[PDB]
Amino acid sequence: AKFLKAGKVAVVVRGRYAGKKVVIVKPHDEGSKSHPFGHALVAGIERYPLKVTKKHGAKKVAKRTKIKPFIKVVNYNHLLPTRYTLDVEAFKSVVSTETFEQPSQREEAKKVVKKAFEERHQAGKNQWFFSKLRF
Amino acid sequence: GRVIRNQRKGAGSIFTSHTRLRQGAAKLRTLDYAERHGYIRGIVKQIVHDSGRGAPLAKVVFRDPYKYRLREEIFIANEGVHTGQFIYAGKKASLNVGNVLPLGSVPEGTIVSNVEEKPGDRGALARASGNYVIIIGHNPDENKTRVRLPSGAKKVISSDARGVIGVIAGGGRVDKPLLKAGRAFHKYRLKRNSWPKTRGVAMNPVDHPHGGGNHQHIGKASTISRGAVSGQKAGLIAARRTGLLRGSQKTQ
Amino acid sequence: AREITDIKQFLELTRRADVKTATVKINKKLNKAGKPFRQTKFKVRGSSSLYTLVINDAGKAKKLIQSLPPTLKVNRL
Amino acid sequence: SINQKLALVIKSGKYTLGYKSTVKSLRQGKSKLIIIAANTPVLRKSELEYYAMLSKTKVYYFQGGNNELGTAVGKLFRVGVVSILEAGDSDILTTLA
Amino acid sequence: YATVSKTHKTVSRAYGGSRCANCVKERIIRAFLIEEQKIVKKVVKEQTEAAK
Amino acid sequence: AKRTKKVGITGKYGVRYGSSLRRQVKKLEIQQHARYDCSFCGKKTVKRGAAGIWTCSCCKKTVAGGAYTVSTAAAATVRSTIRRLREMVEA
RNA sequence: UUUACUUAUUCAAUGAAGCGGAGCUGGAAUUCAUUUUCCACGUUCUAGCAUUCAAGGUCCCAUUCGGGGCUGAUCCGGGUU
RNA sequence: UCUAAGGGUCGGGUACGAUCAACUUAGAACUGGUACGGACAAGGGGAAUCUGACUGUCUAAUUAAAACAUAGCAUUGCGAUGGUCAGAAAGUGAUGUUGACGCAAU
RNA sequence: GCUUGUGACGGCCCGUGAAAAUCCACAGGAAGGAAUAGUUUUCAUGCCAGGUCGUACUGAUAACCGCAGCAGGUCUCCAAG
RNA sequence: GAUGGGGAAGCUCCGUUUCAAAGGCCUGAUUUUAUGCAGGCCACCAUCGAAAGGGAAUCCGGUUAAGAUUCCGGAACCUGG
Ligand SMILES: [Mg+2]
Ligand SMILES: [Mg+2]
Ligand SMILES: [Mg+2]
Ligand SMILES: [Mg+2]
Ligand SMILES: [Mg+2]
Ligand SMILES: [Mg+2]
Ligand SMILES: [Mg+2]
Ligand SMILES: [Mg+2]
Ligand SMILES: [Mg+2]
Ligand SMILES: [Mg+2]
Ligand SMILES: [Mg+2]
Ligand SMILES: [Mg+2]
Ligand SMILES: [Mg+2]
Ligand SMILES: [Mg+2]
Ligand SMILES: [Mg+2]
Ligand SMILES: [Mg+2]
Ligand SMILES: [Mg+2]
Ligand SMILES: [Mg+2]
């Protein structure tokens, strides 16, 4: 299918976020007035949770498991579509075209996705995704 | 009577090798655990020209089974191997050009380079651009393997002597006339001070056994005895025949 | 070594602690095509470099001059 | 032959040539079959292979180099991958392939 | 290069001032794919070891 | 305009060394300067430089080969045998 | 005299790293009582990544943050090979 | 003293015009006490014999050659516990960062 | 135009044409670090100090070597019409 | 070319990381006190050898009988703290 649909996981392949894993939340298959290319709106993980261990106690665990997100308008030709896939519904809304334009709105979206992304990492749910891709 | 030229060479003065530019010494990986129980993968990272050498070298890097670090080797590149190729070295390793394998684990007729005489000597036979050795049989009890070296000599070594599948790159180098003195000059310029060569027969008697006389001539049989003595031995040493080899050579 | 144009920023150099001396230079120059105009360069000797500020406009300069810190040590011309 | 089929397509169907644009086609799921030349590197191959499974698209490993694949599709240049979007009369889509 | 600020010695993607970006693109795909295939390799020959 | 009747690239040497030596060099020179097909991307862009080192303009792969030609009869037929012998140890 | 031994003597290799012996498990094997045995006993589409006594499991310190044992990684001989 | 040919740079709805800057080369007149690469600069040529193929080398200070070297050709030794060579000796050295498409000796 | 610097190319090789100090970067993520206030000196500005020996002239038909103010020899850079 | 060594009657010869028990960095542990020990590494093996090779950083104007990228004037830059 047109597999770049509403839940597909992909890896960024070009530019800062290169190497980082994402989730498409809304695809603009063909075109923008701007973005003259097939492009996706992804929220993804910029600074992954650091591996946690038995030794890790109390507050360090809390510390180690902080996630740092990001949100990107990104050309299809810079995503490696994955076989995997993650539920988008809690930040369906918060990641929009209108989200971009104005920083404040962008900062908020990341707050939201962050709350989302961190909750999700606790209790397994969507593993792999919260694990760095080494290269 | 003067010390003659071939005695002078041994004290190594002007006669030592011209070594400054060489890539390093080519030699198989040390025969460790990996290589003799299983196998181990590398990448040929670069195949590169060693000065005063017939054949290309091949820089080939591996992991260090015991420490987190890269350790690289210098291989004489067998013809056909290439940058980026994977190389496997070990008892249980596959039989392709480039890989290195104990002469036991390859069937008769296999063709291998840089093969060691004793296992772990990091490789001694067949290293010149062009040369190789063919395995011509095994004797499983007391694990030997018999080969035929470049010379034509057969010789029978341990089954654990590592060889490397293939022949040595840069072959046929010697079909091209040197054409002028300069090329020979530049050839030797990067090996050692052994060119050009004055004939013993153009020297005075101080200089050589061939020295002097009113015409140029050797004056006595130039086939010299094995049990000659330094200063005598020049000509055809221990020569067991002499003259134009008429008739097909090739050992039986 | 440094040319400056923010007339704000400038003033903040002149009151910048490490700044003992200053020096004004005056220049007859020509404007655009025909006429002349009186250029003035405002040089502040800081510790690690000399900041200079050109006021092409005559008026803009005269006013700027009385502004100079009473406790600064201007070299006139 | 397989060439013969392919040549049928090329004279009556719809197709795109080359890596960048058969990926456009794979994304769109427009591709019915993609044809892969021998010498084409494994990264490229494995990458297509992946885009291929994702779009649920069968894959044929042309047992020939990119030079001839170009000949196959009747083009005076080389091609390292073909994508079928519309098979003309040819049965490549529903034969041995 | 030690008399000159950090930004002058890098670009902002992973392996900034070190590998050629078109070369990181490559790292990534390969990384991803070889790792994915590992799973297939694991689970294909896992199948064997119940049917052989 | 046909420039030499036969000495070809060997013209630089002019009259020296003798027809026969020139004849031999001409062969391997033509061999060694020539531009070859690349196994890997399939563009004829493999040129020599340094004996036995053949490397490729685009796609940058260096292949170890014969001293004046990319592949060598011997090395081919060895390739050939190693095939043969390998297969004996898969089935 | 032959041919066998290894500790003298001799030769090589290595930041003396995995040797020799036994056991586990797979499995060919054909069972003439039941095992007599023989091999195996974590890596091969790809110019990626492989490091912090390791994560896991389990046991302690007296729970704070830190940290230790054991296992993961089977035994026995200290003949580096 | 004339003639001809060989260039730049600008606007044109989606055929040209305007100028700026160059020594090259050929052609034609006129002219002189037939001179003019006017000083400077600047190969003598040809036909053979002997001999070394060529370029290169040497007797500093009586020999530059036909002598040495060279490519090419041919022979010899050697698979490392080795060939050839060094040292009084040695837990010593040259070839050797080497392996017969090699090193050594003619 | 001449000198010289440099670039993108191209020719050649059985010749493919040094080393080390030193400097930077990236992969890694040990660890440390905030709201009643933390982290930051690879951004700017500001403070201090920087020892030791050589430094004259000649470099040649007179400062060097040839017994000498010897027609010899003795490494280089700049270069007008 | 010193060094554990190995030769040599001996002056000395050989070996240069070599059949050697070949060493120092980061900071924690101190709040008896200054540095014992708590980690963890690195096994790198002397040294001399370039006033043309490598290499942190300066320019202009003025100035002397004779010094100047060294003085003075101005304006910088590097290294360490
Ligand atoms: Mg040497
Ligand atoms: Mg000589
Ligand atoms: Mg000869
Ligand atoms: Mg001779
Ligand atoms: Mg000779
Ligand atoms: Mg003579
Ligand atoms: Mg004599
Ligand atoms: Mg005699
Ligand atoms: Mg004689
Ligand atoms: Mg004679
Ligand atoms: Mg930058
Ligand atoms: Mg990072
Ligand atoms: Mg050992
Ligand atoms: Mg004209
Ligand atoms: Mg004009
Ligand atoms: Mg006419
Ligand atoms: Mg005569
Ligand atoms: Mg001559």
Ligand SMILES: [Mg+2]
């Ligand atoms: Mg000449």
Ligand SMILES: [Mg+2]
């Ligand atoms: Mg003379």
Ligand SMILES: [Mg+2]
């Ligand atoms: Mg004399």
Ligand SMILES: [Mg+2]
């Ligand atoms: Mg002469």
Ligand SMILES: [Mg+2]
């Ligand atoms: Mg003379």
Ligand SMILES: [Mg+2]
């Ligand atoms: Mg002849």
Ligand SMILES: [Mg+2]
């Ligand atoms: Mg001894």
Ligand SMILES: [Mg+2]
């Ligand atoms: Mg010059």
Ligand SMILES: [Mg+2]
């Ligand atoms: Mg080059």
Ligand SMILES: [Mg+2]
């Ligand atoms: Mg850098």
Ligand SMILES: [Mg+2]
């Ligand atoms: Mg810790």
Ligand SMILES: [Mg+2]
């Ligand atoms: Mg700073």
Ligand SMILES: [Mg+2]
């Ligand atoms: Mg001076």
Ligand SMILES: [Mg+2]
């Ligand atoms: Mg003088």
Ligand SMILES: [Mg+2]
């Ligand atoms: Mg004198």
Ligand SMILES: [Mg+2]
């Ligand atoms: Mg004189």
